[PDB]
């Protein structure tokens, strides 16, 4: 039965990724006075299937200068991390219930930077390596703000347990208590998934596709699935962290509906950023992180350590 739980978690997530491709294309199209996929199936509903089928029957050109061991290990690591990021998530009850769930997510997402450091190195070409190094530096630099923002927010939670976030946000959203940290967290999440003006590793008009140039068909498809799973997962984490839904122990379907709707709204906002802004330069986003986000994050961590102590509002640790 637990195996069935794992399967009924993984497979719907991959399906949601597949149709997130369609949803993103349609949202971009309608923001651009066009339609997007509306021919292949009703309202493009069979388009993700067409993409998945075409990709797995397309020739996966592997580079002659590629260390194939890591060339295939990188997609495995990426997709395995992208899937395992959902196992502690408290759609009302988690698959895996840990004391340190958000710490587990921080660690697992920090292991995901290897899939770029290994793909760029394995692909050789002597230039995709530079794009991979830029991506890794961006990822590790925004890990700092992710970690510190999570630390400051959880000082109202009292623990690293994600189920406790539901209890913490019973009467009020955590957004009303930490909105500046919410904006910085949301932009950090944007930057970590290489999205929006932070998509420097796959700049369509900067370096064509960067670290993913040599990957084609199948491994490219799995990398794409990993990225979109990470996008939906990060938006789910954001919804649980800042927009906690009311929970009825006798009707958890209500919480699930609430959470899914809020996660979809945040994902649609992620696609909304993509259609509205130009692209940051690499040094420009590094400057943003290091000289704008980091000082405010340090100050707000200070503030959120001081605040529960000076108001006798320290949460329980149980």
């Amino acid at each position: 039965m637990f195996m069935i739980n794992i399967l009924s978690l993984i497979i719907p997530i991959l399906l949601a990724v597949a149709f997130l491709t369609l949803v993103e294309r349609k949202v971009l199209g309608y923001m651009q006075l066009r339609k997007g996929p509306n021919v292949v199936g009703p309202y493009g509903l069979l388009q993700p299937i067409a993409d998945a089928l075409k990709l797995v029957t397309k020739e996966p050109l592997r580079p002659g200068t590629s260390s194939i061991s890591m060339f295939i290990i990188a997609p495995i690591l990426g997709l395995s991390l992208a899937l395992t990021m959902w196992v502690p998530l408290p759609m009302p009850y988690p698959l895996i219930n840990m004391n340190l769930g958000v710490l587990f997510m921080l660690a697992m997402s920090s292991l995901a930077v290897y899939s770029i450091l290994w793909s760029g190195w394995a692909s050789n070409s002597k230039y995709a390596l530079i794009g991979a190094l830029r991506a890794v530096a961006q990822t590790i630099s925004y890990e700092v703000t992710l970690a510190i923002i999570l630390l400051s927010v959880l000082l109202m939670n009292g623990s690293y347990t994600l189920s406790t976030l539901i209890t913490t946000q019973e009467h009020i959203w955590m957004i009303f208590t930490s909105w500046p940290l919410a904006m910085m967290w949301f932009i950090s999440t944007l930057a970590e998934t290489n999205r929006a003006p932070f998509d420097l590793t796959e700049g369509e008009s900067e370096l064509v596709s960067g670290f993913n140039v040599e990957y084609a068909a199948g491994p490219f498809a799995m990398f794409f699935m990993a990225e979109y799973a990470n996008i939906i997962m990060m938006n789910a984490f954001t919804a649980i962290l800042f927009l906690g839904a009311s929970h009825d122990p006798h009707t958890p379907e209500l919480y699930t509906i609430n959470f899914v709707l809020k996660t979809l709204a945040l994902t649609i906002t992620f696609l909304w950023i993509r259609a509205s802004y130009p692209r940051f330069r690499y040094d420009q986003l590094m400057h943003l992180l290091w000289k704008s986000f980091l000082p405010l994050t340090l100050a707000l961590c200070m503030w959120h350590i001081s605040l529960p102590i000076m108001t006798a509002s320290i949460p329980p640790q149980s």
Partner: peptide, 22 residues
């Protein structure tokens, strides 16, 4: 508070609710 970024988001949101020229 990123107000002009919010204006850009508003412009794209307004275009999403316009009939496409396709």
């Amino acid at each position: 508070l990123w107000t002009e970024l919010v204006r850009g988001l508003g412009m794209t949101l307004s275009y999403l609710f316009r009939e496409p020229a396709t």
